Write a protein that binds this DNA or RNA. Structure first.
Ligand SMILES: [Zn+2]
Lengths: 924, 149, 330, 147, 79
RNA sequence: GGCGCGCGCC
RNA sequence: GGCGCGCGCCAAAAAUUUUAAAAAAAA
């Protein structure tokens, strides 16, 4: 169980300093600095910056949480200077490679004693302020490199990137595997659950940790909303921070009126910006082609001047100098210079690396004035603007489309202020008819989502841990911040069960046994009634009676719309949907774009509107039928329908007739007769029951049902508490170990044999399959180019509707690879592991085998770029990953003790690395 | 004795299984029997004509209702063979004579198989409200088994 | 009891012995049941003639012109077969009759609601494939199920007929091939190929210029030089721009006509050049193990891709001696 | 004796209030004066006469029934109410203009068609239930008929 | 591409895409003109011209209609 | 349809 | 002047190319 106590520290307004430390240790205010500061800054230091520096002085780990536009990196620079002064090596771990290169340039210009260690370059390895990507740090720790021997600090940049859900695990492995004497500086975006992370660090390393949270920004922002269809822009969130409900209501009213019924739309907004002097702007669209589309549409504006055009031409020529002739004259590079000339740039993941770097440099200098980029640009280092425009508000994350989370909106709106130059940023959001006040209000009035781990075992972690002694995978599973964030919830459930138990023990009905029996029989009668209802709703016994005038009663669990006149029905995949004509409230019609219907409140006037429903939600299919007007678009027609229902209902003072299931429907199954007989027996028993005949007994029934609800809650909480006291993933680990030992990797007593040792190295690709293929002798027959082509199967992870036409030299081995994948998938599946062979084998996309084989034999880059439909950036990324993977494969084949495969992989890596695809970055 | 009652009740239930069609749900509060009350009961048979003209038939009935309502402001007691619709059990004044069937016709292609006929006014078709007297010459005018007129 | 019950039940009794051959038409039709209300007593002959007219209308269209009726509407399970008084022996013909006699509907029309039961027959459980169903017109706005909101003819594409017999009915930044699929040209000027094909040589003015000056300056090329002054107001609690340098050059219409070419305004029908059409007039108007423990067994970590600072960034930075931010900051 | 019983049954039928509402302009009856029967005649109208009642059937004619070899003249004949052998129940679709010979010939052909449809006899009306005669005397006569 | 397209007919056989494109470019911005390809690959007795703007087809009709090309008038139609 | 070329008839 | 027949011509004829999206990243 966690043993950590958190104490707040008195501080100036804005920042909220707190310290989480082990329970046994007592708290004493950290001593004021002594001596000369490691480095001094010209501008005044804000409160939170000063406190972070103070905490860095006393060699106590610290976690800073503040807006990117508030200057967190000053603390990291101070820590680096302090570590360098004492002749102490330091490491700066950053998520992405591009940000790593930018930070390397900045720190090299600063201290001149820096190095880089990313996966595609090793500059000045024997430095004292290394900068690296967390993956390489993890690899160093697992392989026990001595470089980490002397480190006195480690600085993690943007630890909020730990919830990535695909590579947000390496952070936890690296944090766990590090020794206890190395201190930590974590820099994160604003998150609410910072104290939990501080407590996790304190518990895991036994050392105190500090948290500084500040929600202050230098330049205030004003928000605007553009309703697609309207004309102007409305001021929803003022610079003061308060929300103006009236203007948002007006904007959504305009949107609703427009939807009830310059050339483009973003073109108008950009022109308005140009003419209103909000020039330097970033247009955020969440597609690789919406950005290009909106960029090309603006072929009529001109932002720059002749001198700026000259400078842009000079910079572009200097940058592109590094390429080769035929690579210089590529269409992609040539047809973008005109865009840069007049002050427009596009920046998404599909472009070549060189164009992205050049556009970043130009924007930083200020030549560009309108950058159409995806969210990849939101993390760039110190590249703000005076305005940020959101073309869309629905992004496709890994799983499926969704509205952008308020965290991402805050992060992107944080790129809308430059300290001193412009004294008020403007953020403009373009909404659509799909947006409804239930989404816009949340997005504008939300807060950053918490930080929740994404730990999940993998074969590489398991194999590497098994290789080294004095540690086992259970150790990693038990200290993963998943187990911590789970154990931290036990007090809540304990209090919940205590309170619910007391509530259970409080209310006592005057009579227990007889009232309980009465409740039980009544509930059983209700269950039998529901069984009959489900029997009615059969495909062949309910469809004929649903007609465009049919009167039905519809209610969902706990909510009843009431009587509605069936308007239509249809099928879909089987399940059927019946469009009925119910009553709905205005608060439910307004949000109808992305909401389900809700019943209107009888005390207030509603509106008769069409609602789709499923057959399962129909209670009674009444026999009555109405004369439908056949035109239900006007409001008055539906009001007349409501009046007709009113009259029909008033014509049957004792209730509308209902179709009799047994005879009217025409069902002759023994089930209905037996159920009816049982219902008759139960109702007779109830009527003859001494308690039932007694009137004034609804109060006792209400108390009894409340007690039953309390009992259900207590049962749920009890099972939760009993399940929440054991490791949540031991079954996964045991299944993984079973798979490893059955295949031939591990041994009876968890001893790693040669196969497992070899499979330890291969990291980026899939480990089990590659090791198994190499061991059997699959690669012993393929050629160097064929081998590289085939390896290209494991590194592509992009959706693509196109398909290959593999010839009789690349198709052959693909069948064998798929066969081995099937064998491995079956072995895993029979070990009670939730693996679907179809999906598992559908992830080895061979779409690039022909491209890579053509490119690995002396072919240009335009030639191959014309052989596919995916962007060129994706081809370059795949080729870089294949290069690194082939390096690792060469090392593994060396380890096995076989040299011929080493030669084969060496030939592949010789023939697949010549041209722009591996053009050294210009940020170094 | 009890065997006889068992047989009778079994037969009655067996017959009333199909008598559901001629069953008007009870609890209907319909006073002013002359105007408020059913109009027809069109048992659609299994013939393609009715199958594909159901909608036209319903429109025709609605048109009859509208026409009578419009021209209202602009008796024929049932014949001895007038049955009453059987109400399922779940002041019958104005609920007795309202659900009285007068005329049951099964329309074939070329002859309407009729039964229960239809009423008239004190044996006076020339005044009754449903009879369509054809046009004929009456060239005989001699009663077959009595002195001629 | 049973006497009156059977009196009521004989209403559904069809006499036996009725020979039937074409069951789809050699059988009964709707068996109306009049009742004791004026709206039904008065209009008896109207209803009888209406059903006869329904038969006649079916005869006029189905039997004569379309001659297409092959419905497969089997009775729905709530159907009923009319009882029959036994006066002839059951056989194949009488079973066929029972097939013919099958109530597939029932209604009791009141003034403003019909106590229907037995519903209507079905065709593959879809009203669009049915016969008597009529679907009203509505909105279909919610599109969120209450139960679970998270759900060869070229003319029309129809794979049932031919297009000729069917009455029924973005771009990559570097792909500028929209206007270069075949070639590129210019407005105003006349190319040699157009000169030769059009049948008009250099000495003769281009012909379409006549009707062009008859009409006016093209709007097609005027829009290109149209930077509309987008009017958007920041609602807090038009002077369109013309680029007068992209105007096309049209000798003989606005610019001075070429010298030596005769003014053939009387030929082909036209009027002489007007002041308004002149260029100036209009244009101006606009227990972790030690590191020695992990490394045992596996290949030690290595450095690969050794490189040195190319210096390209230093050159680019030196080139950026001045720039907007650099000038403003200092 | 049984002839007397049949006479009593059909005297119960031919009473006004139990037979007139069934006399409609298409009602297909059969009329037969002693010895000579016309065949099947369609009612066309009926009326009182200062009390006796008369029914204008449409019968084949040579008033006497037409010969088998000849073709009936198919004319309206005003028979007495209680000369009707059997008030069958198949009401026909009448043209409303029985003046031209074509209409009457078509009516004859329609009756021939109806006869063809029913091989064994034609449905009749049962006085017990169809006409709703609740006379205990009729019940006694029925019992006598059954014995 | 329905109201921004214009149909042409009464054209000499040698007339190809380039000539018609050049002729129609004067009236307004022309995106592409395709001489219809017969099932044998031969041209057809008509052509389609696509205009960038929606206010260009009426003017192209009112200006280029009955123009004598290759000594042969051309009949032009909307869509 | 006519420019009409050409031939024939009244 | 009137009428008939062999026929080039433009005049005018139709014509009118059918089949669902999506961000980022590395040992
Ligand atoms: Zn079609």
């Amino acid at each position: 169980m966690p043993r950590v106590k958190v104490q707040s520290v008195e501080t100036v307004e804005g920042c909220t300093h707190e310290v989480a430390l082990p329970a046994e240790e007592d708290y004493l205010p950290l001593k004021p600095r002594v001596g000369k500061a490691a480095k001094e800054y010209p501008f005044i230091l804000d409160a939170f910056q000063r406190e972070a520096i103070q905490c860095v002085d006393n060699n106590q780990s610290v976690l800073v949480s503040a807006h990117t536009s508030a200057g967190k990196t000053v603390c990291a620079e101070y820590a680096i200077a302090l570590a360098l002064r004492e002749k102490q090596r330091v490491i700066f771990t950053s998520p992405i490679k591009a940000l790593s290169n930018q930070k390397y340039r900045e720190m090299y210009e600063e201290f001149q004693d820096v190095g880089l260690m990313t996966g595609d370059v090793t500059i000045n390895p024997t430095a004292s302020c290394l900068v690296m990507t967390t993956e390489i740090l993890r690899s160093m720790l697992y392989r026990g490199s001595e470089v980490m021997r002397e480190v006195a600090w480690v600085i993690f940049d943007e630890i909020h990137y730990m919830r990535d859900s695909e590579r947000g695990v390496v952070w936890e492995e690296t944090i766990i595997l590090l020794p206890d004497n190395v201190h930590y500086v974590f820099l994160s975006a604003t998150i609410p659950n910072a104290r939990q992370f501080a407590e996790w660090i304190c518990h895991l390393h036994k050392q105190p940790c500090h948290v500084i949270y500040t929600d202050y920004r230098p330049t205030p922002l004003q928000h605007y909303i553009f309703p697609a269809g309207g004309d102007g822009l409305h001021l929803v969130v003022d610079e003061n921070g308060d929300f103006r409900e009236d203007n948002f209501n007006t904007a959504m009213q305009v949107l609703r009126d427009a939807g009830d019924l310059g050339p483009s739309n973003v073109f108008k907004i950009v022109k308005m910006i140009m003419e209103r002097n909000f020039q330097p702007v970033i247009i955020f669209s969440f597609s690789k082609k919406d950005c290009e589309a909106y960029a090309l549409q603006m072929t009529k504006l001109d932002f720059n001047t002749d001198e700026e055009k000259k400078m842009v031409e000079e910079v572009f020529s200097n940058a592109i100098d590094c390429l080769s002739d035929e690579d210089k004259k590529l269409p992609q590079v040539e047809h973008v210079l005109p865009l840069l000339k007049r002050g427009i740039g596009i920046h998404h993941g599909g472009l070549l690396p060189i164009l992205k770097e050049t556009i970043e440099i130009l924007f930083s200098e200020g030549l560009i004035k309108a950058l159409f980029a995806t969210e990849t640009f939101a993390m760039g280092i110190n590249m703000p603007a005076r305005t940020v425009l959101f073309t869309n508000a629905r992004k496709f994350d890994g799983k499926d489309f969704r509205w952008i989370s308020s965290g991402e909106y805050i992060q992107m709106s944080g790129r809308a202020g430059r300290r001193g130059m412009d004294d008020r940023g403007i953020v403009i959001l373009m909404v659509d008819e799909k947006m409804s006040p239930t989404i816009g209000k949340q997005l504008l009035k939300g807060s950053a989502d918490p930080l929740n781990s994404a730990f999940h075992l993998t074969y590489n972690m398991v194999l590497n841990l098994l290789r080294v002694e004095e540690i086992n995978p259970e150790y990693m599973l038990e200290k993963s911040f998943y187990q911590f964030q789970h154990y931290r919830a036990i007090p809540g459930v304990v209090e919940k069960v205590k309170n619910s138990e007391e509530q259970y023990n409080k209310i006592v009905i005057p009579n227990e046994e007889s009232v309980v029996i009465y409740y039980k029989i009544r509930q059983q009668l209700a269950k039998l009634g529901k069984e009959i209802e489900e029997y009615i709703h059969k495909p062949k016994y309910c469809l004929p009676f649903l007609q465009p005038g049919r009167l039905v009663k519809v209610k969902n669990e706990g909510d009843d719309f009431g009587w509605g006149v069936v308007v239509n029905f249809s099928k879909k995949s089987p399940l059927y949907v019946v469009e009925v004509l119910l009553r709905c409230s205005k608060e439910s019609l307004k949000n109808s774009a992305t909401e389900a219907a809700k019943p209107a409140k009888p005390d207030e006037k509603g509106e008769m509107q069409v609602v789709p429903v499923l057959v399962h939600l129909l209670s009674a299919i009444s026999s009555v039928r109405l004369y439908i007007p056949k035109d239900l678009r006007p409001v008055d027609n539906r009001q007349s329908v409501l009046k007709s229902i009113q009259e029909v209902q008033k014509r049957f003072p004792d209730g509308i007739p209902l179709l009799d299931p047994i005879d009217d429907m025409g069902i002759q199954d023994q089930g209905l007769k037996k159920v009816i007989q049982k219902v008759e027996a139960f109702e007779h028993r109830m009527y003859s029951h001494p308690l039932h005949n007694d009137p004034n007994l609804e109060t006792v029934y209400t108390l009894c049902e409340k007690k039953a609800q309390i009992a259900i809650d207590i049962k749920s909480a009890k099972r939760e508490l009993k399940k929440a006291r054991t490791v949540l993933q031991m079954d996964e680990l045991k299944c993984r170990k079973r798979v490893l030992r059955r295949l031939g990797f591990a041994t009876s007593s968890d001893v790693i044999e040669m196969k497992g040792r070899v499979a330890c190295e291969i990291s980026s690709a899939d480990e089990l399959l590659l090791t198994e293929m190499m061991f059997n002798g699959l690669f012993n027959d393929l050629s160097a180019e064929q081998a590289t082509a085939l390896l290209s199967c494991f590194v592509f992870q992009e959706n693509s509707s196109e398909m290959p036409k593999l010839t009789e030299q690349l198709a052959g081995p693909l069948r064998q690879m798929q066969e081995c994948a099937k064998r491995i998938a079956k072995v895993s599946a029979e070990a009670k592991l939730e693996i679907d062979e179809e999906t598992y084998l559908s992830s080895f996309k061979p779409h690039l085998m022909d491209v890579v084989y053509t490119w690995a034999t002396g072919a240009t880059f335009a030639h191959i770029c014309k052989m596919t439909d995916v962007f060129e950036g994706s081809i370059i990324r795949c080729m870089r990953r294949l290069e690194e993977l082939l390096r690792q494969m060469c090392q593994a084949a060396k380890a096995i003790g076989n040299t011929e495969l080493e030669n084969k992989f060496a030939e592949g890596i010789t023939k697949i690395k010549r041209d722009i695809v591996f053009a050294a970055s210009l940020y170094l | 004795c009890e065997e006889t009652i068992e047989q009778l009740r079994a037969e009655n239930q067996e017959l009333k299984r199909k008598l559901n069609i001629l069953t008007r749900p009870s609890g209907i509060l319909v006073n002013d029997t002359k105007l408020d009350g059913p109009i027809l009961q069109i048992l659609f048979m299994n013939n393609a004509i009715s199958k594909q003209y159901h909608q036209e038939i319903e429109e025709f009935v609605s048109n009859l209702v509208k026409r009578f309502e419009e021209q209202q402001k602009n008796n024929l007691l049932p014949q001895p063979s007038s049955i009453v619709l059987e109400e399922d059990h779940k002041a019958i004044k104005n609920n007795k004579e309202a659900f009285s069937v007068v005329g049951s016709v099964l329309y074939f292609t070329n002859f309407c198989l009729d039964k229960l006929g239809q009423p008239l006014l004190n044996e006076n078709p020339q005044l009754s409200e449903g009879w369509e007297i054809p046009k004929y010459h009456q060239v005989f005018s001699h009663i077959v088994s009595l002195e001629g007129q | 009891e049973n006497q009156e019950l059977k009196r009521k039940l004989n209403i559904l009794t069809r006499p036996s012995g009725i020979l039937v051959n074409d069951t789809k038409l050699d059988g009964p039709i709707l068996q109306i049941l009049f009742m004791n209300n004026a709206i039904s007593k008065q209009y008896h002959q109207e209803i009888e003639e209406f059903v006869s007219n329904l038969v006649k209308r079916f005869e006029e269209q189905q039997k004569n012109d379309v001659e297409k009726t092959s419905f497969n509407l089997l009775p729905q399970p709530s159907s009923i077969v009319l009882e029959e008084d036994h006066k002839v022996e059951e056989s194949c013909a009488i079973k066929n009759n029972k097939e013919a006699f099958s109530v597939v509907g029932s209604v009791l029309y009141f003034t403003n609601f019909c106590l229907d039961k037995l519903g209507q027959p079905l065709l593959n459980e879809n009203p669009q494939l049915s016969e008597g169903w009529e679907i009203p017109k509505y909105h279909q706005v919610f599109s969120h199920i209450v139960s679970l909101e998270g759900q060869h003819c070229f003319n029309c594409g129809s794979e049932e007929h031919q297009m000729k017999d069917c009455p029924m009915p973005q771009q990559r930044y570097h792909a500028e091939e929209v206007e270069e699929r075949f070639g590129r040209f210019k407005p105003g000027v006349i190319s040699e190929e157009l000169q030769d094909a059009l049948g008009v040589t250099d000495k003769s003015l281009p012909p379409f210029i006549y009707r062009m000056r008859q009409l006016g300056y093209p709007p097609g090329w005027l829009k290109e030089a149209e930077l509309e002054n987008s009017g958007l107001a920041l609602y807090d609690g038009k002077s369109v721009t013309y680029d007068l340098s992209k105007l096309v050059n049209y000798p003989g219409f606005n610019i001075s006509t070429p010298r030596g070419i005769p003014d053939e305004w009387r030929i082909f029908g036209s009027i002489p050049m007007q002041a308004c059409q002149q260029k100036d007039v209009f244009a101006n108007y606009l227990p972790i193990p030690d590191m020695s423990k992990f490394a045992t067994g596996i290949t030690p970590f290595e450095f690969e891709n050794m490189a040195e600072s190319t210096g390209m960034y230093l050159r680019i930075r030196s080139l950026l001696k001045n720039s907007p931010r650099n000038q403003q900051k200092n | 004796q049984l002839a007397k019983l049949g006479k009593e049954i059909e005297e119960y039928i031919h009473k006004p209030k139990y037979c007139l509402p069934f006399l409609q302009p298409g009602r297909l009856v059969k009329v037969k004066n002693e010895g000579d029967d016309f065949g099947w005649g369609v009612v066309v109208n009926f009326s009182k006469k200062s009390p006796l009642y008369v029914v204008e059937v449409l019968l084949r004619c040579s008033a006497k029934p037409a010969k088998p070899d000849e073709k009936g003249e198919m004319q309206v004949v005003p028979v007495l109410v209680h000369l009707l052998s059997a008030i069958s129940s198949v009401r026909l679709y009448i043209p409303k203009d029985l003046r031209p010979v074509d209409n009457r010939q078509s009516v004859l052909k329609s009756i021939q068609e109806v006869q063809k449809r029913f091989p064994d006899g034609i449905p009749l009306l049962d006085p017990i239930d169809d006409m709703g005669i609740q006379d205990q005397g009729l019940k006694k006569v029925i019992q006598k008929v059954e014995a | 591409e329905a109201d921004r397209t214009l149909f042409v007919g009464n054209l000499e056989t040698k007339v190809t895409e380039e000539l018609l494109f050049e002729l129609f470019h004067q009236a307004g911005p022309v995106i592409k003109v395709k001489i219809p390809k017969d099932k044998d690959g031969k041209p057809k007795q008509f052509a389609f011209v696509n205009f960038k703007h929606e206010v260009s087809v009426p003017y192209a009709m009112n200006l280029l209609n009955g123009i004598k090309l290759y000594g042969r008038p051309i009949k032009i139609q909307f869509r």
